[PDB]
Amino acid sequence: GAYFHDDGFLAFPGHVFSRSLPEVPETIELEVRTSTASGLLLWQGVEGKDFISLGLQDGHLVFRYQLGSGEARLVSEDPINDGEWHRVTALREGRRGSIQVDGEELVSGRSPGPNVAVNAKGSVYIGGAPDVATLTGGRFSSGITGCVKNLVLHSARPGAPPPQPLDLQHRAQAGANTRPCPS
Ligand SMILES: [Ca+2]
């Protein structure tokens, strides 16, 4: 697992999320541990307004993304801010998205309007970011403090490639204020 602090992060290549057209089922899965009430868990924006992000808001997990005609917001029922490990599964196909925490009833919804694709080829940020306020366009002012493990970034296009937890140490790209995290 990977530990983060003071906006620490780990960056991965935007091809982990190899998107298509028609839109194809998108899977994000991870295990988090943190005492953070507000902060950035994941962000991929275009490097143009399209993005995808997972964050902490009032302890609550939030799934947000923009496809061109308005954001989707999906917030978990309770905070997962308790420093105990929590499984978060965020899924999206086109504008339809959902989140599930552990075994809690899944929250579902969509983005409004006709846009249906995330045109974002930027790096995928986890944990934090070099400068969060700029990257997130004002939506987050910090990363989280804690762990992430069994990160799964899957795009499910007809051939390529099977959905399994990414190796955080060698399968990364950028990185700051981060160290291996035990469990
Ligand atoms: Ca778009």
Side-chain angles (χ1 to χ4, degrees):
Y3 182 91
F4 307 100
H5 58 86
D6 314 286
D7 305 320
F9 67 89
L10 235 37
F12 311 84
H15 64 74
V16 298
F17 264 142
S18 289
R19 305 222 172 78
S20 200
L21 186 157
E23 332 90 60
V24 207
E26 209 164 79
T27 286
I28 298 173
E29 198 152 38
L30 68 92
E31 284 202 74
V32 56
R33 205 166 57 194
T34 178
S35 193
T36 286
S38 285
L40 174 82
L41 225 175
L42 177 163
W43 179 277
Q44 155 159 71
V46 314
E47 317 291 295
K49 223 56 194 183
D50 277 19
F51 68 80
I52 278 165
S53 74
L54 268 175
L56 279 155
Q57 194 200 290
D58 286 345
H60 288 65
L61 161 91
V62 306
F63 189 16
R64 279 163 83 191
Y65 60 94
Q66 154 88 81
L67 311 184
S69 57
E71 291 185 11
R73 176 81 73 157
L74 293 69
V75 193
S76 55
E77 266 293 298
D78 302 280
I80 51 148
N81 187 202
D82 50 26
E84 101 181 69
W85 281 113
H86 298 281
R87 189 94 212 182
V88 327
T89 294
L91 312 174
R92 185 189 57 92
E93 193 206 69
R95 39 175 275 186
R96 175 62 50 184
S98 61
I99 50 142
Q100 186 154 48
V101 193
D102 301 311
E104 316 299 83
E105 227 182 10
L106 71 68
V107 194
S108 178
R110 49 182 54 218
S111 51
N115 274 260
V116 306
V118 177
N119 301 105
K121 288 193 76 176
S123 302
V124 172
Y125 290 91
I126 270 83
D131 168 36
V132 195
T134 297
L135 167 64
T136 60
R139 300 172 181 89
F140 293 102
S141 63
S142 67
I144 70 151
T145 314
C147 293
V148 183
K149 65 180 200 182
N150 310 331
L151 182 43
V152 162
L153 303 178
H154 183 56
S155 344
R157 301 181 318 289
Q164 269 138 50
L166 271 50
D167 190 306
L168 307 169
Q169 295 302 287
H170 249 78
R171 191 83 98 83
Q173 151 204 312
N177 283 331
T178 167
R179 65 173 167 77
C181 141
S183 61

